Scaffold this active site. Structure first.
Site, PDB file in Angstrom:
ATOM      1  N   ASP A 171     -56.785 -40.541 -30.633  1.00  0.00           N
ATOM      2  CA  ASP A 171     -55.782 -39.478 -30.485  1.00  0.00           C
ATOM      3  C   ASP A 171     -55.040 -39.262 -31.806  1.00  0.00           C
ATOM      4  OD1 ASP A 171     -53.643 -37.880 -29.806  1.00  0.00           O
ATOM      5  OD2 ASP A 171     -53.303 -38.828 -27.849  1.00  0.00           O
ATOM      6  N   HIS A 202     -57.281 -37.027 -27.550  1.00  0.00           N
ATOM      7  CA  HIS A 202     -56.040 -36.740 -26.896  1.00  0.00           C
ATOM      8  C   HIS A 202     -56.173 -36.334 -25.471  1.00  0.00           C
ATOM      9  CE1 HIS A 202     -51.810 -35.745 -26.474  1.00  0.00           C
ATOM     10  NE2 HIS A 202     -52.103 -34.459 -26.222  1.00  0.00           N
TER      11      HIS A 202
END
Length: 233
Positions: A171, A202
């Site tokens: 992420d 993410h």
């Protein structure tokens, strides 16, 4: 999409709608779902349906109603993504916590409530889920892929009920130093859990996302359901 007629009133008189799914059987614990940066959209409809299939009732409040009521943006469309980022940038996080606290009060008094309320947040909602866990409004809280947790470490000792967080290992919002800060900080309170999903970005649990990773999403969601199950009668 919101359920017609549902209106929750907040600490300051502001009111907002919500998508509500009644449980298959009464009574049931109620899960408040804190949405992503895109409002109450197809993924929220999916999440409500899933939690109802797993033995909960669900309430997903319209958190963007202070700015633009009924926001429901499709992440496939650029123009709508741009709208999401504009709304997120302007989002009042403290008012968001207040609205979620009101949604939790609403959830606790639903006619089929068994007295227990959980919170599950994604993206924007994942960060709000930590803030609500620190307030203590809720029996158990879950956050997926929250941004900026490394800036909220002073709140770790405030958490007095269990909270579970799922975070992608790739992420870009949580680079290596941030991951280290969160891991060490959250580790100090055994009421908190933070799991990292190596090779996942993410929005790894959002069906349809180019970030979606089926194995990681499956493991995160199994952990979520096992963590919420104690709220069931």
């Amino acid at each position: 999409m919101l359920t017609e007629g549902i209106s929750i009133q907040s600490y300051d008189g502001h009111t907002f709608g919500a998508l509500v799914g009644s449980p298959a059987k009464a009574p049931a614990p109620v899960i408040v779902i804190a949405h992503e940066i895109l409002g109450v959209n197809a993924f929220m409809r999916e999440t409500v349906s899933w939690l109802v299939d797993q033995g909960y009732a669900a309430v997903c409040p319209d958190l963007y109603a202070r700015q633009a009521p009924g926001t429901a943006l499709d992440p496939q469309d650029e123009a709508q993504r741009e709208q999401a980022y504009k709304l997120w940038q302007a989002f009042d996080m403290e008012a968001g916590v207040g609205d979620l606290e009101a949604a939790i009060r609403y959830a606790r008094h639903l006619p089929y409530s068994n007295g227990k309320v959980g919170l599950v947040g994604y993206s924007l909602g994942g960060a709000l889920a930590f803030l609500v866990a620190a307030k203590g409004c809720v029996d158990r809280a879950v956050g997926y892929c929250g941004v900026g947790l490394e800036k909220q470490l002073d709140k770790v000792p405030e958490v007095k009920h269990p909270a579970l967080f799922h975070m992608g290992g790739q992420d870009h919002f949580v680079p290596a130093p941030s991951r280290q800060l969160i891991t060490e900080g959250f580790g100090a309170n055994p009421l908190l859990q933070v799991h990292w999903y190596e090779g996942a970005g993410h929005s790894f649990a959002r069906t349809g996302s180019s970030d979606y990773v089926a194995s990681a999403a499956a493991l995160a969601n199994e952990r979520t359901l096992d963590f919420l199950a104690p709220l069931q009668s």
